[PDB]
Amino acid sequence: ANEFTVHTDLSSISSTRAFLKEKHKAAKHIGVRADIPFDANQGIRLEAGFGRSKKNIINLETDENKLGKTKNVKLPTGVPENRIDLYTGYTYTQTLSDSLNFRVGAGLGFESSKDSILHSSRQSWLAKVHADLLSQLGNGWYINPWSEVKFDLNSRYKLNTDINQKTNGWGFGLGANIGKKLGASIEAGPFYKQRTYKESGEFSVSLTIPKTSIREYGLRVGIKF
Numbered sequence: 001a002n003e004f005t006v007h008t009d010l011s012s013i014s015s016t017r018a019f020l021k022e023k024h025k026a027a028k029h030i031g032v033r034a035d036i037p038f039d040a041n042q043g044i045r046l047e048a049g050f051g052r053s054k055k056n057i058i059n060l061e062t063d064e065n066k067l068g069k070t071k072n073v074k075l076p077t078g079v080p081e082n083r084i085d086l087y088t089g090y091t092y093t094q095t096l097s098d099s100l101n102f103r104v105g106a107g108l109g110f111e112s113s114k115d116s117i118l119h120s121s122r123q124s125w126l127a128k129v130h131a132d133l134l135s136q137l138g139n140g141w142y143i144n145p146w147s148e149v150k151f152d153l154n155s156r157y158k159l160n161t162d163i164n165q166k167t168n169g170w171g172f173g174l175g176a177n178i179g180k181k182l183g184a185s186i187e188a189g190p191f192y193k194q195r196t197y198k199e200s201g202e203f204s205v206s207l208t209i210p211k212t213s214i215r216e217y218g219l220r221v222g223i224k225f
């Protein structure tokens with residue numbers, strides 16, 4: 001059977017780059033997923049999602065700062081950011097037991113993010129592999145632990161200075177949804193995601209784009225038709 005999920009996330013996102021931290025507020029995301037079987041085991045997965053937050057850029061703490069003896073210059077607050085994600089891939093699913101199903105897939109994806117202070121953009125074409133276990137608990141209840149890993153094939157950092165440099169990286173996500181059939185199913189659960197973009201090669205003033213690391217903790221809630 002075809003399965004379609006619409007979901008929404010509430011999350012805490014933080015990022016570190018060079019000597020700075022970026023903390024997000026009002027981080028929200030909406031997305032959809034379609035798992036479409038073609039035979040007993042093979043299928044296709046399609047995903048699309050849209051996210052938004054506002055971020056404050058802050059310095060890393062030092063004892064000199066805590067002591068008085070220096071003072072941090074003011075940095076931007078309430079910086080808006082928008083994100084989109086898309087994914088299409090092959091899936092293979094099989095039964096491990098009468099109450100346990102195991103699904104694995106791989107495919108191609110796109111991610112982008114844009115902020116405004118000055119616009120910075122990150123656009124990434126990537127490959128993604130994912131695996132998840134669906135375990136029946138009885139009475140229509142289930143648990144669904146999942147994992148996914150992303151690898152950039154062509155990730156570009158853009159800056160309306162203009163700058164457009166390649167910054168390939170990778171990322172991984174892990175979570176687990178607890179769900180219940182309503183006759184449709186409702187599910188909810190925690191997730192963790194991490195994304196790293198490497199420092200770019202030297203480009204011409206000689207510069208690099210600093211290494212960026214993003215970490216995200218959240219709760220996802222979904223309706224599975």
Ligand SMILES: CCCCCCCC
Pocket residue numbers: 145146174175176190191192217218
């Ligand atoms: C089984 C993985 C669960 C993810 C835990 C993330 C921490 C909030």
